[PDB]
Amino acid sequence: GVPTYGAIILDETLENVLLVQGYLAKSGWGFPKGKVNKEEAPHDCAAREVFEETGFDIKDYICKDDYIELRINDQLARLYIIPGIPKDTKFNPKTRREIRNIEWFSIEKLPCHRNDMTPKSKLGLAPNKFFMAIPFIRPLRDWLSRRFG
Template identity: 50%
Template structure:
């Protein structure tokens, strides 16, 4: 399914229907129009808002109405720029706006945690929702005006259901730079090995598991991902 800056998308297909105008209007009102003025001062902030709208659409609208088509974020953004009156004046520039946003996202700082169990022999890894997803430490992009440690606690809670706010020590962290993006991972110790992990967000994390600690040294630091060659030896 292709997207053009000022074009539209076919509203019917064998795989499902595109969202009706009523639903698009509701998403625009909920996620774009009724936000603080400063959140509409840049296209980067606007597309972050549309990203939240896209997650809501996929996790709620599509899940509760199977006749709706699942959309990529790029196609969803195209629909919103073509249907939302506040965004429509800029639809001719959408290709450039989307490209700039993609580049911008790779500069947003990332925070997370390397979580060790109470034996110090295993660390916690999470696997994304898609079958092709890699294993990694729980982590995510900082929100606007969010501190690194606050982001790390939030991301760990969202991805694992584990609250590490009382275990996090501000000075215990490692930091690497990946291109223009800074990644900070806090070292968290003392999490019980029999902890039951339960991701709080829909369709983001499929599995949370403790892995043998020695594998931490096989982390591909440039991407903070576990090499696929080691996956079979993890558990």
């Protein structure tokens, strides 16, 4: 898999995160991110994908050591952590063939796992519109605890 890069954008209170909603296969809510081009540095891909999907330029705010990285089915995803962006910021995708909506969500209300179906004696997981964000939620809460208490 080609690595992906993007951002976890938080507001000034540290309560809220910015998610984006795609279409079709990407029809739920997730962090803004995308696949690296040939020769492109990680920090540059993260600002490019985030600017295409949100209209906000993170390049002046990226810190090189502040990120959460996960490997999911043998594809690496790294999201740079960007705190203190005001909730009244105007966000506007470039690409509205790709992005349906852009919204702030309360971190403490987001799920950090999907629910099973053990009430129906059935295997697997119930559908959840946050499926693409979910793997990052617990590592983000632990990172914010360590760095801010």
